[PDB]
Amino acid sequence: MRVIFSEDHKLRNAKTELYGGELVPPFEAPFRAEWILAAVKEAGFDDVVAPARHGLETVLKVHDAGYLNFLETAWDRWKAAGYKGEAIATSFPVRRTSPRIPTDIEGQIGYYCNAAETAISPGTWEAALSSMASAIDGADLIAAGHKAAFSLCRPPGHHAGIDMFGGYCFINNAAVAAQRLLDKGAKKIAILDVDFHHGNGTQDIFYERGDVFFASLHGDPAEAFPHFLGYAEETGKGAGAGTTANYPMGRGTPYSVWGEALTDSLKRIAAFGAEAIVVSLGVDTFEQDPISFFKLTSPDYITMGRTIAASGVPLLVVMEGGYGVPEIGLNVANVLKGVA
Amino acid sequence: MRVIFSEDHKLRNAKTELYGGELVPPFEAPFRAEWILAAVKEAGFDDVVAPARHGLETVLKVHDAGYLNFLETAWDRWKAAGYKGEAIATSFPVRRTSPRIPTDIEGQIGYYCNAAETAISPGTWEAALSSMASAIDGADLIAAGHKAAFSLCRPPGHHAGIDMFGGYCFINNAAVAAQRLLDKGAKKIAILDVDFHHGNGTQDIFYERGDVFFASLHGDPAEAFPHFLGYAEETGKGAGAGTTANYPMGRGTPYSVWGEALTDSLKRIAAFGAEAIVVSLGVDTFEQDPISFFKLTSPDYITMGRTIAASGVPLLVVMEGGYGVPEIGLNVANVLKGVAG
Ligand SMILES: [K+]
Ligand SMILES: [K+]
Ligand SMILES: [K+]
Ligand code: NA
Ligand code: NA
Ligand SMILES: [Zn+2]
Ligand SMILES: [Zn+2]
């Protein structure tokens, strides 16, 4: 399978992340793409191509225009305001608050944010565009007839909701990919999130749409970021009633239980009738991940990939989470091995 | 008027505050109380008494029990979880999110917070309780028959809602004081928030309550913290309809315009029929204060006190915000002179 990768991902190189009450070096650093890229090539996937140029037409069908306009100029405005650090929101539109949109940069960054551990830095916008481009190109390959494809996205995107950034995400790459397949002719597409954290951004985007089925396996929100979405009771709303399936699991969950949730999600995706599956791939489900509590081993990823590929429909794999140890590359490559 | 002040306020001495993308020393520091106290004493108000001991009965009538339980054990759980810094929420229940309450410290701190620039640290719980106590004793003096009283509260409270802390606030002292007056006999009470920022927390607590009228003058939320509340359109909900009046104002607002809003809020308060008025006093409206965009001068705080005191009803002044500028005490003292007459 071809691999879509952009070097502009390095344009996103934030110097701080709010974690544990301190501003430490970002968990989502440029070396993640470097390590993963090296491992896939090592696993035989050496056909890496850069993404072509794309407009905002696709993304404008899954993200709010106000939100996108905000991201494009967020940094400039923050710096213009005289702030010394990176752009970080501290005030949020939570319970029982007005739906009105602030005008100043301080108010808008909070309005458009769901997580304060994510800082907007110089070049974040450009990086997010390149990453989105990689997802769009991967979709085109699938739309062209290829059975599999890997969009090495960075920054990740499953936490980017309709009009909010957070969890290191700015533009929901998988959502853009699924939307791309639809504009290319598909009628039904499914997004499967295997990343450890719930794909709240993705769920929000398609929660009221019946044309995209969203399935996510993840750490119980009761005790895992993003914390405020991902419960099994969330199955869809209105036009999207019934097209959302969350599978929250506790601490220490091994492939034994995980594998079962995967099977079920695939059963519901088939029943949905997906013409293709966009896989939000996160390897932070690894037993050695620094910020997750699942216990999957490197071999499990080969099993995971094979199972998903057995669906019989084309697959577009999109990079999401996975941090710390260098095995993230191994684990990502193992998934592509299974799929191939 | 008598001044209620607790030394335990210093127990609230957070080391960090998220501002402009950095962690810096909190703007709501202990020296604020120190300079305010000294200024009011120099102005004659030197009858300072420490607050008495109080339970949680009053506060439990305005704050969610879960939220209060969270505050009490917040720091211990955060430390136990192994975080090196102070407790600061990073994830928040914003638009289109589940109403379920997380079970771990990481999720709950976010669930109970409305502003990440506030950090919970050793002593916050204790400090917040002593500050609440000062508010309670202040209200008790009013219920006794005193014309006015000053509760030198710290930490402040008007940004703490029913079940959320933020804006340097944990327990809404003004709200507690108002509840206390109702418990001592009053049927109707009003809270007037003159602090530069909107008192989103106080509004939240009494938004569906008809026994307490909430008026507030503040910088337009469209361009000022807390950013998501304080619009003129918010007049109340359900049982609390019509008992909430917001007076947002733009950049460079002179006392000339500010006083007009003060006069209208007092007119609405009088029409409501308040038996007493709790004044959430913030002096960050001062032209020399760095965080605000209003242009009030020191003399205007004397006018402010006079006007509110002219209402004819007893007044409990509760200390809120105000950047730590050298004139912070002078301005608070001027408001008290105005009330004194
Ligand atoms: K997931
Ligand atoms: K105010
Ligand atoms: K000012
Ligand atoms: Na859906
Ligand atoms: Na009210
Ligand atoms: Zn993840
Ligand atoms: Zn203030």
Q: What is the DSSP string of A289-330?
A: -TT----B-HHHHHHHHHHHHTT-S-EEEEE----SSTHHHH
In chain A, residues with a C-beta closer than 8 Å to the C-beta of B238 are none
CA end-to-end span of chain B, whole Å? 11
- Residue ranges of alpha helices (H) inside chain A are 31-42, 65-80, 105-111, 124-144, 173-183, 200-206, 255-272, 298-309, 327-339
Left (φ > 0), alpha (ψ -120 to 50) or beta: where does B47 sit?
A: beta
SS3 call for B155:
coil
Tell me the torsion sign for CA atoms A276, A282, A288, A293: negative
Phi/psi of residue A219, nearest 5 degrees:
-65, 140
Reference A139, options A126, A151, A154; nearest CA is A151
Which residues neighbour ligand 6 (ion) by CB within 5 Å? A 195-197, 282, 284, 321
**Cα A110 from Cα B221, distance rounded (Å):** 13
**Residue whose entry in the numeric block shows the structure tokens 């193992």:** A334
Whether the Cβ atoms of residue A132 and residue A173 lie closer than 8 Å to each other: yes
Q: Does B282 touch chain A (CB under 8 A)?
A: no
How many other CB atoms are there within 10 angstroms of residue A80's CB atom? 10
SS3 call for B70:
helix
Resolution in Å, one decimal place: 2.3
- The H or E element spanning position B318 is strand B315-319
Tell me the CA distances in angstroms from A201 to A60, A162, A166, B67, B90, one per residue in order: 15, 7, 9, 27, 16
Picking from A19, A102, A228, the nearest residue to B222 by CB comes out as: A102
Whether the Cβ atoms of residue A144 and residue A150 lie closer than 8 Å to each other: no
Phi/psi of residue A275, nearest 5 degrees:
-85, -15
In chain A, residues with a C-beta closer than 8 Å to the C-beta of B203 are none
Tell me the CA distances in angstroms from B29 to A160, B15, B32, B155, B322, one per residue in order: 36, 9, 6, 9, 11
CA atoms within 13 A on the CB side of B187: 2
Those of residues 87-146 in B touching chain A at CB distance below 8 A are 87-98, 100, 102-104, 106-107, 110-111, 113-117, 119
Going by the DSSP 8-state scheme, the letter that residue A142 receives in this structure is H
Q: Which two tokens stand for residue A254?
A: 């091994």
Three state DSSP letters for B93-149: CCCCCCCCCCCCHHHHHHHCECECCCCECCCHHHHHHHHHHHHHHHHHHHHHCCCEE
- Does B23 contact A19 at a Cβ distance shorter than 8 Å? no
CA atoms within 13 A on the CB side of A221: 26
- Omega of the bond prior to B155 within 30 degrees of 0, cis? yes
**Which residue precedes each gap in chain B (C to N above 2.5 Å)?**
none
- Omega of the bond prior to A122 within 30 degrees of 0, cis? no
**Cα A333 from Cα A336, distance rounded (Å):** 5
Q: Residues B319, B323, B327, CA angle at the centre, nearest 5°? A: 85
Whether the Cβ atoms of residue B150 and residue B336 lie closer than 8 Å to each other: yes
**Cα A202 from Cα A283, distance rounded (Å):** 18
How many other CB atoms are there within 10 angstroms of residue A81's CB atom? 12
**Cα A216 from Cα A206, distance rounded (Å):** 13
CATH fold for the domain made of B1-341: Arginase; Chain A (3.40.800)
Q: Which two tokens stand for residue A58?
A: 């696709």
Which residues of B form the catalytic set?
159
Q: Domain extents for chain A?
A: 1-340
- With both helix axes pointing from N to C terminus, report the angle between B328-340 and B31-42 in degrees, rounded to the nearest 10: 40
Q: Which two tokens stand for residue B331?
A: 């301005």
Going by the DSSP 8-state scheme, the letter that residue A11 receives in this structure is G
- The H or E element spanning position A216 is strand A212-219
Q: The domain at A1-340 falls in which architecture?
A: 3-Layer(aba) Sandwich (3.40)
SS3 call for A68:
helix
Amino acid identity of residue A110, one-letter, is G
**Cα B242 from Cα B238, distance rounded (Å):** 9
**Residue whose entry in the numeric block shows the structure tokens 């929660």:** A207
CA end-to-end span of chain A, whole Å? 7
Task: Say how far residue A249 (Cα) sits from the centre of its chain.
Answer: 19
Pairing of strands A2-4, A48-49: parallel
Phi/psi of residue B249, nearest 5 degrees:
-140, 145
Pairing of strands A17-19, A22-24: antiparallel
- Residue ranges of alpha helices (H) inside chain B are 31-42, 65-80, 105-111, 124-144, 173-183, 200-206, 255-272, 298-309, 328-340
- With both helix axes pointing from N to C terminus, report the angle between A124-144 and A65-80 in degrees, rounded to the nearest 10: 150
